[PDB]
Amino acid sequence: MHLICQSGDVLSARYEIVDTLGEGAFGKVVECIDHKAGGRHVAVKIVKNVDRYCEAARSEIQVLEHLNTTDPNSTFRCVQMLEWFEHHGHICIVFELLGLSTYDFIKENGFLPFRLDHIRKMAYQICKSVNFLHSNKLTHTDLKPENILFVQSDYTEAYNPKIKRDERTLINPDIKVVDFGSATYDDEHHSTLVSTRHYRAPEVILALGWSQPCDVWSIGCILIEYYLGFTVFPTHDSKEHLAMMERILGPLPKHMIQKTRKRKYFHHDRLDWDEHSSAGRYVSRACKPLKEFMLSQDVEHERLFDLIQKMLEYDPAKRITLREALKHPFFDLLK
Template identity: 25%
Template sequence: MWESFRDLLYRNPNHRFTEDLLKAGLIQIFLALDYLHTECKLVQTDIKSDNILQEIEDKSILESFTQAELKSPSPRKTVNDLPIYASRRFDLPKVFGRAVLSDFGSAVQGVERRNHDAQPNIYRSPEVMLKTDWSYPVDIWNVGAMVWDLFEGRHLFYGNDPDGKGYSTRAHLAEVMGFLGPPPLDMLQRGKRSHEFFTSDGKWKQDIEIPTGVSLELSEEFLDGKNKEMFIAFMRGMLQWRPEDRKTAKELLQDPWLND
């Protein structure tokens, strides 16, 4: 394996992926998720740029790594009779290998419905935040939110509470409502935490404002015309309040924008 998507993101001076690089990576991610969800019956729950690695296609970086180490060995020290080495980075390859989904330490069986906390904060799906039973669709939401980091160069949701204490579920939910509108009442009725944030008839009851004047269309900055419309439609296939309304990995592989 070469470095992760996160490393590649920061190697790029623009700190964002090109459209072609994003599409190529997403096709590999959806292939992995389709296999994981349908064949392995597993939910990954921790999809982020750190956990997507790239295979080494350009073998010349191995030779240059070896020669660099021979000419100038990495700094090292001994702790408890064991050598500790400083890391040496690979060169940027001339061609990139396949994207590989990694780190399954938090994966769970998808056939068992769960409602425990999961996912990185900014990528948490509505069903995890509201504590409804969740399964495979949490991974789809997770990918949708991560796409914004890779392509737009910033998070779609931050969840920073105005109380100054950092991330909070209520701030995150408010942001999601700003982009997607209020959650469906039937979904709120399934959530064990819904009463903390909403009244019984679905009204927001937290003392935090729902953002106005925001949308996926307004937030997307690098596309235009029909291509932008297709991209937003692709995103909406993943970013839906109800998990059952989201497309599956197999369906997303057939998306027109991804295959344009």
Template identity: 30%
Template sequence: MLILNSKQHGPSAQRKPQRFNLGGILKKNFAWKKSVNSLASTLDTVQLDYPSPAIAGIDAIPGSPPQRKSSGVLQAGLVFAGKSHGLVPSASSAFGDNYTTYPACLSDVLIPRSENAPMSSSESSADDTPFNTECISLLNSDLTSEMNMDNVFDSYFCCSKPASAESDVISFNEHSEEKITDYSILGYHPVKIGDEFTSDISRYRVLRKLGWGHFSTVWLCSSLISGQFVALKIVKLGKNYTEAALDEISILRLLQEDDKGYPVDDSPVVSLLDHFTIQGPNGTHIAMAFELMGENLLHLIFQNKSQKFAAASQKEPVSPYLLPVDTLRLIIFQLLQGTDYMHRHSVIHTDIKPENILITHKAEISGDIFPLKIPTKFQILPSQPLHQSTSAEEPIEIKVADLGNATFCNLHLSDHIQTRQYRAPEILLGHSWGALADVWSIGCLIFELLTGDYLFEPNLGASFTKDEDHLAQIIELLGVFPSMEYAQDCERYRKYFLDNNSLRHISKLKFWSLESVLEEKYKFDMADDNIKLLCDLLLKCLRYDLSERYDCGSLMAHPFFKKDAKFDQRECDELPNNNFNVPGFTCEEQAP
């Protein structure tokens, strides 16, 4: 959402803001947000051979992110031997041909970026990236890959070309997967199909790659003890990653056990089944075995956008809804339910977004999930998440996942939270924050599930930062500036505002209400009761004042979730808001 491409004054400044353009259904090209870059490697060669049995150290190296604040929970029992961070000599002769040394320059390919695309965090000024230092899975939330609409969906859904008879290399889209340079010091653990990993309670065999992120790679595995299928998450090396993984384990255990330590049935959060360590060529990695889930909501969004794009190309009638209303209602309610469950257990997710909401996989695991060709040497493989039917006959079920950045209501592990598009104003402005930061993210996600586009998509300008553009977009949508009473508690208010009615570097704003956006841009019928109710629900999530922002439990009683609900303004206005019952809903405080 851009206010103006150049923030110029004059008549041209009165046109509609260039808002909500990312991923537009009928646009030929669009910027696709993904974590496609990670810790930069300065090595001439990437070492993927197993060196000696010694374990590499994980102490911070020059240029590494500052330490994540740690709760100190579950951090005993891991011993790391010190080792220099230089390039390890090749040991392929000692360990056979299972691992290969790659020149970094062959795969460290920079993805072209259009002239108007946002700058990466490494190219923008330090003033513009105050939140990119400690929150390790958010380091690349501002990076953009430019992809052509003709192949974006195939590449995202991992439709790789089969390997040729002459080659042992399985093809993959290098722009959609992790980079080979990230398998160097402090990087990923090199995993091959057929690898086996042993914990205290099981032994897991790797069957297929499910996905990856800045934090880890994820693999479909079978337990050789129980026969159960699991998703094995193998975390990157590095002190920040290890501490975050240990904090995630402690938080998941808290959410999965009752007061007496017994497992909780039907938890709305993805279940952790096992955790252990893996010794790799560069050090010891944390591994976590989760219950097997299907694809995430981002896949669902892309799938439905692809279908709408194809239908529009054939000049077929297209509904403005990205998802059927009943599916939308079910997903939002379960998302509120899962987040409320965490909040009632004094846990804040801090990174609610489509990638972190998983669809329950109900289908049987069949033989077609196994790769037709298994490479003999390590190589990057295409991600192949388990697709799940979302037909109306089988109601969709979701669970909240990826608590690598989660924190406690009474002990914030980091203040650098939330992916850019879902970041709340209290985080941008340095206000106290609490559980209701998740609710702002849910509001942004509701819009994305409704339209397929980001609600807020800030850009870096010549005279303003992404944070200031982000604040301008929020003000334009909500139609009001933060109150002076709210501003007095914001550390960075004067950095962006001259007074309570003007931004420091963006003088021209074009207010465009949510109702007008949906009607004028997305062609929704504003006489539709569902749209009216959704607007009210969404705006209850997007309030500056944390005492006025609704909590998830209160929103679950919203009339939108009633069968055949009709819009009644009085009923919406009188919806009770019990956010004060949520521990730490506005700030870091002792839970009752």
């Protein structure tokens, strides 16, 4: 991979790499000048030459052809694929060039949260985009701030020598959704593990089956993050994650606890969790009932938190849908 991305390299005798934009499990994404479209800059995703990532990338191309055909204007804000090719046996998918990921924008600002007026506009566009997937018998399964990109470099930035970095101020918060390598059709085989730990729904953790509602959970976690500047589930352990859920959202529904085949996590009908261990006191300390994360009691803030709370319903059958979410009072201001 290192051997076929470098600045100056030309892919498919037209795409000149000028920069690396990002990396994930799949491989890398680079910025290219397209010398055969008048020098337009594009994003090219170069996939690892590994079976599971090759298959995920053919899956992604297939989803993109479907979404881009269904929604040619990108009204529902799924990234447009321009084409795909093979480069030294790696699949390369060419995209319209977007701007920063919401992850990178927040991280590089020192994990400062987005303005509430921006979160409103971004939440709406994310729900509108993922609900278009939901309407078309798809679940994304891997919604996270890294997979939400600003459309434009509609921001300013100045070097602040006090904190020795650039601060980026957002002008227009318009986003698109990316990465359809995990996106699963209703009728296809559902992977057991989906989503990256922090944005994974309880039905996924407990292996109870999943579909569209697990996207809604993920979006709930994103909105939290946008508001605070960090996750409420900062963990790398499934049981601790569940312990964190219990502290933030209250006890798991007995019916999910009792139904799960992931019984290692439990003892009779409670999380097998030592609250009085130093790991348990860590969770109690770091985690609090959701509403206590609110930075203002202002109604606008209550409206967002009420949507977040419905998005983080434990029971996927009770969880708000995005169709419902798009009608929530938090978005009334947009209309």
